[PDB]
């Protein structure tokens, strides 16, 4: 576990490692926004 | 010291959020890397500031 | 390689060397069992290194001068019987009774005839039992199945487990022509080895000679006639 | 021009008036696979028997040893081998390396540098012709899946004798055991596997189909309708628009591909990715990471369980499972 | 079936094997830490038979240059010597601890350098490690 | 940034427009960079955050922190994990670490300089100048030189390393005389790849580990500083294509063989991956089976060296095909396997029979017992044991998941390889985009 | 077995310093554009 | 539950945090 | 022992050579090729047309 100062972080540390995936996704909502151009 | 210690925890997460979000905003617009570029550093060193206090704070919380 | 050699060396300077299937040589020592005190010994890292493998053939050519043939080995450096331990007895007469009793005692072993037959066999000196004197002692050995009771033939059949008949065949299976092929049997059968002591080093207990055992082939659990195997080679022990 | 003997010998090597092209890579493709084309032929019609599983039960694959073309097949190495470089100068006779399962190291260690060369091969003509480099990339799709079966299988398993066998029946043994030990139909992979050679067969007709069905007239009929094609021909010898407009009504008119070079990507692209991903199953699968398992997935309130169709096929992957390599086995786990 | 008593076999840890099998027991019972530390008089036992080997069998082994068998003998019935002497120190009062963390780090740099002279089969420079080796786990167990 | 209308390329080969924009390429390479340090710092806290410390690390899906562990942190004798606050700091600081790269990241490719040539000479660079390429190489191969430098600085200055094959039991320990002989270094390089060898994936002793990293170490540097100082020659110049595609084409087949290498280290190799943490290997489970009924059925009576299998061979011992008493049934294959809890029973012959019926330890019996009920097997849904296995246990070996993904990783760099180095060639030779209309080459070529 | 594998040895090496030495020899400049 | 409800609403943000800097960049005409 | 073989098997030796006449197998086949080779690099360059000096090669 995480040091008890650290405890109320917990759930922010449950969802940090899936933030790289999100960047291949926002390239492609980003080429969206800009008609594929 | 364990509720200031998370008290700057949560403001240097508060920082890195707006961080996230309003570096690529100012850096993509055009006049923003000009004018709010000043507004940037200051978000930059209250951010390192965070860091090393949180740092320091950590060793008389941990 | 003598025993302290050996035991000398890193397990990765033998691994693939092969020297892993030699047994120790006795160097000194003596050529007399007399330096040995009577009494029973006990038998320890007994371990006999075969030389030669040969297999006794029917004569066509009439005669029925049935010789022991040249072979070559199939199976590789897997042939050796080592850590075999047991008591062993000397007397002041130079009488010497050798007794095996665990350890490896067995390994199999295929070997190809001229033609083109493969012969296995399960070299063994499982309870070898030897007396005599010191130029020749010899006993039987007992050779246990080639194949386990429960080994499955590629039908199915075995002995203690599988098909007692041809399933392939619902209908001309249990005829007389596969009956002996259905049952099976994992029966053991005996041999007889002589062996010989040639070094004997009473300052460490240790002793060397050759042995030559005759013993039966695999039978293939009942299904085939064994044929007869002659076994030369060295072995070694050290008494304690 | 050329007067040095290297100078002629790259010249003639890299020459593309040869019949056959050769290049670099055919000086590696052509000896490994000629020697891997010897071995297998003498071996398939006359090597004796040879002990797979290391319990000293030799099985019979040669034609002369009482085997068809069906059930004919170059055995793996001996399990008492392992992963065990076995060349023939490691044996001390021709006779134990033929029993130990021998020529089987040999054809795929040379087979596997052959189809390796044989990908570099089909990039250095291209090269040399001035077209394109990626049919060496189509074609390392197949190349994946004769590298997964061959080497990575048999090295994450720690042996040559859980290798495909050269044969027949000998792959369908291959097929039968790595269901009942990886469930290899619950895999994604072969899932994806089968969706390229069902979608690729499926596009394949539909293109062949839809071109046939767009010839523009040039023959009779007493002819036949390839007689209207003349090799070299700089017009088109069907009408793409006429196939789009068949097609687009066939289902809807943006489920068509207007432009050739889209169709034939697609044509290209759905195979390969769908062959590289089940190449990866099996080599994922080689160490270890086996497919879905839902069995017992579904129980009732009390804590009965309900069984579902993955049960069943449970039912028969036990049943392969308890009879593949009947004496091999000492210990209940097969973890090897 | 023909009966057979083994009985017996639960002496002398026939559940041995399924105790580290039981995913249900923590890890620290399953690999038999937590046993030693919790009754301290079986891990004091295993540091004497640990010092028994190497002030006996050692010694025998480099005069005769068996030098795969003092490896192992530096590895087996002592592969849990680091372990043991670890846990008898943590019980220790913390100004004692310090000194017998001291003494025990001393112990494993002689019993390594000594398992490089074995590796080397440098039989003079291992006689001497083998001495040094057997002086500082002397010091050890005196402080613990 | 740009379009299609200008570029000539897609949206999809979008990062291609970067070839000849070395600014914002220089922020592209800093950003996958941050992308790479954020993802062990995000994975290092989401490990220490759901680990539990009544199971060993790898039957908790933790792959970071077994690295971590054999570095010696945070680990007591024996492999337990005695403290966690050391794998903490690690994912901070690289958390903390990934920001101000992501920032050089964003910044170098946003608003920064598109091209460096004008601006800052010293980093400028075109594909074509191989002296400049070089120095490049160079620099960046001085760095990792150091980096190695730092391995063999932490395992005999700093604390030290787990070492598995540590006298007393595994620990970490001070490697105090490193093997640097060239025989030994040339030794494993040179080792043929099959069993018994297994090229560098065997080498058995943290002293050859950080040997080893000594050489590659020094050979970097040296490396560096000549590839600083020197520029191609003329044999070099004309065997490669000194285009930007081109570079990336080798550099890509390279990591093809290590993400290979990696596949094949984490599933034999004790060594740097000790099962104390990544759990059994393949070969110890095996292995580890037969022993343990082995043990239990001396208990209950019976001459494990005398008992026979159904085949005839050796139902618990037998030799392997080289005269080693090895142990029997199917895991034949996996006698040249080595491990911390089953060298003590192995003499110079083998296993040693006297040894395996009188002085099997304890510990040995635990260690084998739970390697083999934690074997490498597993389902994708992380379903523990064989395929044909109920819903139970919940267990996937780490070894499974760094071996599984790194081959698909390192085969589908091997496509990288195929694409980017043909396209390199053919774009170079000027036909990439087709054949020449006018100027068909095969045309002009005599019939076959 | 050694003359098989010396034999052996004397033609792997052949083929594969012909091929080690064949990209070597200006291989990308055996290309038909300009 | 309150776990999950931080998970997700952790989640939440991060998730929508990328997505917010092109609407912005959008909505005022940012050279995105 | 019954028969002879090379014994060679899973020992790590350096690219396979048990005994030192493999090594001059290698070398001597390797300094032919790399002979015939070197004494043809300027005529295979000269093909090119242009002199192999530090802007030779295929370059995009
Ligand atoms: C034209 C354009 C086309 C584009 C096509 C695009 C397609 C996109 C396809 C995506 C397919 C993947 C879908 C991912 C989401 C599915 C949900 C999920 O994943 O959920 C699955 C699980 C669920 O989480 C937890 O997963 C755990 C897994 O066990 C792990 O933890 C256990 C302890 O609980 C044990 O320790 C065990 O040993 C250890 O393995 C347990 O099962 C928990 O109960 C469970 O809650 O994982 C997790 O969510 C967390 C891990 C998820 C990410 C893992 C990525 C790393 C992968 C490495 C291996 C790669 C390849 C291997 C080969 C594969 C062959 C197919
Ligand atoms: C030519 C056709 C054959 C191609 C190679 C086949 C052999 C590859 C193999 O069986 O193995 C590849 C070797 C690993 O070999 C294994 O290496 C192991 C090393 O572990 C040994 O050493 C370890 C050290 O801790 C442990 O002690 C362990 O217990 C001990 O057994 C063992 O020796 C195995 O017997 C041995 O097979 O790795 C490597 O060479 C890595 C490079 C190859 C990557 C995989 C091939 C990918 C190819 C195309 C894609
Ligand atoms: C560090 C390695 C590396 C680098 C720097 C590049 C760089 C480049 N590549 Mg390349 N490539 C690589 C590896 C690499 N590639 C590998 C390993 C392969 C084999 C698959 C390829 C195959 C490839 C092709 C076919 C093409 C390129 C192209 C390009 C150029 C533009 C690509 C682009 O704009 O991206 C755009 C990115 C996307 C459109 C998103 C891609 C979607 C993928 C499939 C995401 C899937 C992720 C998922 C987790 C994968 C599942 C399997 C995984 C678990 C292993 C560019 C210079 C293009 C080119 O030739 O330029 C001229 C081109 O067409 N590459
Ligand atoms: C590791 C992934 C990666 C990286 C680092 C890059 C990087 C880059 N890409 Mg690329 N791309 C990628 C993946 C990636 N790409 C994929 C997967 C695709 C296929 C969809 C593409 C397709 C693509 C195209 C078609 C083009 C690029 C282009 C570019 C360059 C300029 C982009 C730009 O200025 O527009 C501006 C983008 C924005 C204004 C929106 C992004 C705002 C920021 C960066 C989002 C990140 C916020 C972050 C969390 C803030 C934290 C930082 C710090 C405060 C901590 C740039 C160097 C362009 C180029 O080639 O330049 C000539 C371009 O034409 N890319
Ligand atoms: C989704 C992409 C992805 C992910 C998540 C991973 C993840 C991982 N990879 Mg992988 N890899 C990938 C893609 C990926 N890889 C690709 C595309 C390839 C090419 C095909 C590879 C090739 C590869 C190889 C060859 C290896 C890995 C390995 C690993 C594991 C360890 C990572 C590591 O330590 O690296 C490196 C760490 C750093 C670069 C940071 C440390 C650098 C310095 C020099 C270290 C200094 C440490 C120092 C001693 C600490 C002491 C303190 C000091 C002050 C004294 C890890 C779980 C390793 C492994 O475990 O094998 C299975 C490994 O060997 N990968
Ligand atoms: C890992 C990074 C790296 C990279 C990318 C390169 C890349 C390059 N090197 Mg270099 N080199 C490196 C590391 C690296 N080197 C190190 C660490 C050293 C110190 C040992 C050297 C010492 C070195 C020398 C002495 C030379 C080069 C040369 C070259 C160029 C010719 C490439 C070649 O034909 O080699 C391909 C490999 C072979 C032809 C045979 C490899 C056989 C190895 C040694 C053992 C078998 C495996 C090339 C651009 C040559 C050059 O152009 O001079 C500037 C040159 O003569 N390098
Ligand atoms: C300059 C001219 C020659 C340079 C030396 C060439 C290699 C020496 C002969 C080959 C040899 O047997 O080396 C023997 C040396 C001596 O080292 C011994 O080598 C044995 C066989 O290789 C074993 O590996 C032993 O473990 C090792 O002690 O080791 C090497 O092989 C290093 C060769 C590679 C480095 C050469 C210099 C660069
Ligand atoms: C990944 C790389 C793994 C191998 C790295 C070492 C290479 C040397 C080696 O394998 O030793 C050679 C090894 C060792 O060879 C064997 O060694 C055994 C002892 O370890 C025994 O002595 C055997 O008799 C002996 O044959 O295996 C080979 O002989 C295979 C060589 C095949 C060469 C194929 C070349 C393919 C084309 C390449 C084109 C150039 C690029
Ligand atoms: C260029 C571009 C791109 C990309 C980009 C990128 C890739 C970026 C990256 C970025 C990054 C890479 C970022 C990072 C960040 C980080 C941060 C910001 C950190 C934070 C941290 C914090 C805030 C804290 C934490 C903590 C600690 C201290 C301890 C424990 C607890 C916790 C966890 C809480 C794209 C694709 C879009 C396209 C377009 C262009
Ligand atoms: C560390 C940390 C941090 C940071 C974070 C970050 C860095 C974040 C970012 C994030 C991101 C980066 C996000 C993004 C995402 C993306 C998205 C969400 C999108 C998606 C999309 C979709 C889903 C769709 C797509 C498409 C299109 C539109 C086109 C067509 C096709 C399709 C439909 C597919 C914070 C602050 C928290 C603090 C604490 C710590
Ligand atoms: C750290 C360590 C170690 C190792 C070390 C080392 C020392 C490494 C090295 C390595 C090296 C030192 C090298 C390797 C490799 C290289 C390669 C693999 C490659 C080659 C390539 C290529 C690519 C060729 C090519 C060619 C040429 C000639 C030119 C052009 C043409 C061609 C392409 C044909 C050991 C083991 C102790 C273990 C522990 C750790
Ligand atoms: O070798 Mn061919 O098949 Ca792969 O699992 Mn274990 O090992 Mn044997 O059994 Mn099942
Ligand atoms: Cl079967
Ligand atoms: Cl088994």
């Known amino acids: 576990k995480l040091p008890e100062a650290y405890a109320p972080f917990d759930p922010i540390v449950d969802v940090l490692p899936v933030i790289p995936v999100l960047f291949l996704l926002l390239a492609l909502v980003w080429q969206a926004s800009v008609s594929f151009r | 010291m364990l509720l200031i210690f998370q008290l700057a925890l949560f403001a240097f997460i508060v920082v890195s959020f707006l961080l996230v979000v309003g570096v690529p905003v100012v850096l993509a617009t055009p006049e923003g890397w000009a004018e709010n570029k000043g507004t940037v550093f200051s978000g930059i060193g209250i951010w390192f500031l965070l860091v090393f206090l949180v740092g320091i704070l950590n060793s008389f919380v941990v | 390689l003598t025993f302290d050699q050996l035991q000398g060396l890193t397990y990765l300077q033998v691994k693939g060397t092969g020297i892993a299937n030699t047994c120790p040589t006795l160097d000194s020592g003596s050529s007399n069992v007399k330096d040995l005190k009577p009494g029973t010994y006990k038998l320890g890292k007994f371990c006999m290194e075969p030389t030669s493998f040969t297999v006794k053939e029917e004569s066509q050519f009439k005669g029925g001068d049935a010789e022991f043939v040249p072979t070559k080995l199939m199976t590789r450096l897997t042939y050796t019987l080592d850590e075999m331990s047991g008591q062993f007895k000397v007397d002041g007469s130079g009488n010497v009774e050798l007794k095996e009793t665990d350890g490896i005692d067995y390994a199999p072993v295929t070997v190809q005839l001229p033609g083109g037959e493969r012969v296995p066999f399960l070299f063994s000196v499982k309870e070898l039992d030897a007396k005599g004197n010191a130029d020749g002692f010899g006993g039987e050995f007992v050779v246990p199945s080639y194949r386990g009771a429960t080994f499955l033939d590629p039908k199915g059949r075995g002995a203690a487990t599988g098909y007692d008949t041809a399933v392939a065949l619902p209908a001309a299976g249990d005829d007389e022509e596969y009956l002996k092929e259905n049952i099976k049997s994992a029966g053991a059968m005996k041999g007889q080895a002589v062996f010989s002591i040639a070094k004997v080093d009473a300052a460490t207990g240790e002793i060397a000679g050759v042995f030559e055992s005759v013993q039966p082939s695999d039978t293939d659990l009942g299904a085939k006639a064994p044929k007869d195997v002659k076994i030369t080679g060295l072995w070694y022990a050290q008494l304690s | 021009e050329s007067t040095s003997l290297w100078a002629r010998f790259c010249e003639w090597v890299t020459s593309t008036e040869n019949r056959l092209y050769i290049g670099w890579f055919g000086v590696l493709m052509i000896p490994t696979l000629l020697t891997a084309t010897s071995v297998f032929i003498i071996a398939f019609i006359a090597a004796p028997p040879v002990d797979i599983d290391g319990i000293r039960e030799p099985v019979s694959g040669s034609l002369l040893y009482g085997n068809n073309i069906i059930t004919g097949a170059i055995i793996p190495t001996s399990n008492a081998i392992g992963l065990h470089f076995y ?80 044969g027949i029946s000998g792959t369908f043994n291959f ?71 068949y097609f687009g009504r066939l289902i809807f008119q943006y489920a068509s591909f207007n432009n050739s070079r889209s169709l034939h990507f697609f044509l290209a692209a759905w195979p390969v990715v769908g062959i590289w991903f089940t190449a990866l199953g099996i080599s994922t699968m080689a160490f270890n990471l086996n497919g879905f398992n839902f069995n017992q997935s579904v129980v009732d309130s009390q804590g009965r369980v309900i069984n579902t169709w993955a049960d069943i096929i449970n039912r028969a992957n036990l049943g392969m499972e308890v009879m593949h390599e009947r004496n091999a086995h000492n210990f209940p786990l097969d973890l090897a | 079936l023909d009966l057979f008593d083994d009985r017996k076999a639960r002496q002398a840890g026939f559940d041995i094997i399924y105790e580290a099998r039981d995913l249900d027991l923590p890890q620290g019972v399953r690999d038999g830490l937590a046993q030693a530390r919790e009754n301290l008089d079986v891990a004091k036992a295993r540091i004497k038979e640990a010092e028994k080997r190497i002030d006996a069998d050692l010694d025998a082994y480099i005069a005769k240059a068996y030098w795969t068998e003092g490896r192992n003998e530096l590895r087996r019935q002592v592969g849990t010597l680091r372990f043991d002497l670890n846990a008898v120190a943590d019980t220790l009062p913390k100004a ?49 | 940034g740009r379009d299609q209308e200008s570029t000539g390329f897609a949206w999809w080969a979008g990062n291609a427009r970067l070839i000849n924009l070395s600014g914002k390429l220089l922020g592209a390479h800093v950003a996958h960079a941050g992308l790479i340090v954020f993802w062990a710092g995000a994975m290092n806290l989401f490990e220490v955050a759901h680990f539990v410390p009544e199971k060993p690390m790898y039957e908790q899906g933790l792959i970071l922190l077994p690295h971590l562990a054999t570095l010696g942190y945070g680990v007591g004798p024996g492999g337990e994990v005695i403290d966690t606050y050391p794998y903490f700091v690690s994912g901070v600081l690289h958390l903390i670490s990934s920001a101000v790269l992501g920032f050089g990241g964003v910044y170098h490719s946003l608003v920064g300089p598109e091209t460096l040539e004008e601006s800052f000479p010293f980093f400028g660079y075109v594909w074509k100048d191989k002296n400049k390429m070089t120095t490049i190489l160079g620099i960046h191969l001085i ?64 002293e050859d580990v950080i040997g080893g990293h000594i050489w590659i170490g020094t050979l970097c540097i040296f490396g560096g500083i000549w590839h600083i100082l020197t520029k191609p020659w003329a044999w070099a110049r004309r065997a490669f294509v000194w285009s930007g595609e081109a570079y990336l084409s080798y550099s890509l087949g390279a990591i093809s063989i290590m993400g290979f290498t990696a596949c094949c280290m984490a599933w034999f190799n004790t060594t740097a991956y000790p099962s104390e943490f990544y759990g059994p290997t393949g070969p110890e489970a095996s292995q580890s089976q037969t022993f343990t009924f082995l043990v239990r059925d001396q208990r209950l009576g019976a001459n494990v060296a005398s008992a026979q299998g159904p085949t005839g061979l050796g139902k618990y011992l037998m030799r392997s095909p080289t005269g080693e008493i090895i142990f029997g049934g199917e895991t034949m294959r996996f006698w040249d396997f080595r491990g911390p809890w089953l060298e003590p029973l192995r003499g110079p012959n083998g296993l040693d029979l006297n040894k395996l019926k009188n002085d099997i330890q304890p510990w040995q019996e635990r260690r084998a017992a739970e390697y083999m009920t934690h074997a490498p097997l597993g389902s994708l849904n992380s379903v523990g044991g064989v395929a044909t296995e109920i819903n139970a246990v919940n267990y996937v070996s780490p070894r499974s998941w760094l071996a599984t993904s790194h081959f698909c990783l390192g085969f589908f760099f091997f496509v990288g390889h195929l694409w980017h180095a043909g396209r390199a060639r053919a774009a170079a030779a000027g036909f990439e985009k087709g054949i020449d209309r006018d100027n068909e080459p095969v045309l002009s070529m005599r019939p076959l | 077995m050694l003359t098989l594998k010396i034999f052996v040895y004397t033609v792997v090496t052949f083929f594969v310093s012909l091929f080690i030495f064949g990209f070597l020899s200006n291989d990308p400049g055996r290309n038909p554009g300009q | 539950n309150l776990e999950i409800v931080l998970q997700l609403t952790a989640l939440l943000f991060i998730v929508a945090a990328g997505p917010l800097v092109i609407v912005l960049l959008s909505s005022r005409g940012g050279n995105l | 022992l019954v028969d002879d073989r090379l014994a060679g098997e899973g020992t790590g030796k350096i690219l396979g050579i048990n005994d030192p006449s493999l090594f001059w197998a290698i070398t001597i086949v390797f300094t032919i090729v790399w002979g015939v080779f070197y004494v043809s690099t300027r005529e295979i360059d000269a093909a090119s047309d242009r002199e192999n000096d530090d802007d030779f090669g295929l370059t995009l």
């Not at chain 4, 209207?228 to 010898?237: I, L, M």
């Not at chain 5, 350098?113 to 490690?129: F, H, I, P, T, Y």
């Open chain 4, 87 to 166: 060349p023939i100068w490691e044996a001390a006779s021709l006779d134990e390396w033929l029993y130990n399962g021998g020529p089987y190291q040999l054809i795929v260690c040379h087979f596997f540098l052959g189809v390796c060369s044989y990908m570099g091969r089909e990039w250095e003509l291209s090269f040399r012709l001035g077209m394109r480099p990626w049919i060496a990339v189509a074609y390392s799709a197949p190349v994946a899946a004769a590298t997964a079966v061959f080497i990575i299988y048999p090295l994450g398993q720690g042996s040559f004798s859980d290798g495909m066998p050269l």
């Open chain 4, 175 to 245: 097929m039968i055991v790595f269901q009942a030990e990886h469930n290899i139909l619950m895999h994604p992979f072969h899932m994806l596997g089968v969706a390229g050679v069902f979608g690729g067969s499926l596009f394949s007709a539909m293109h062949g189909s839809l071109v046939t069905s767009s010839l523009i007239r040039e023959t009779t009929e007493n002819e036949s309708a390839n007689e209207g094609y003349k090799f070299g021909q700089e017009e088109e010898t069907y009408n793409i628009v006429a196939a789009h407009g």
């Open chain 5, 96 to 144: 004692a601890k310090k000194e017998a963390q001291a003494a025990k780090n001393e112990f494993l740099a002689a019993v390594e350098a000594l398992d490089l002279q074995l590796r080397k089969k440098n039989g003079d420079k291992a006689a001497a490690a083998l001495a040094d080796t057997k002086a500082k786990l002397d010091a050890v167990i005196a402080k613990l």
């Open chain 6, 143 to 206: 760095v990792l030189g150091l980096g190695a430098w730092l391995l063999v600085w932490k395992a005999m200055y700093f604390g030290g390393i787990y070492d598995t094959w540590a006298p007393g039991g595994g620990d970490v320990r001070i490697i105090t005389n490193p093997t640097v002989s060239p025989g030994v270094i040339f030794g494993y390089l040179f080792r043929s790849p099959f069993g018994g060898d297994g090229w560098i994936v065997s080498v058995d002793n943290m």
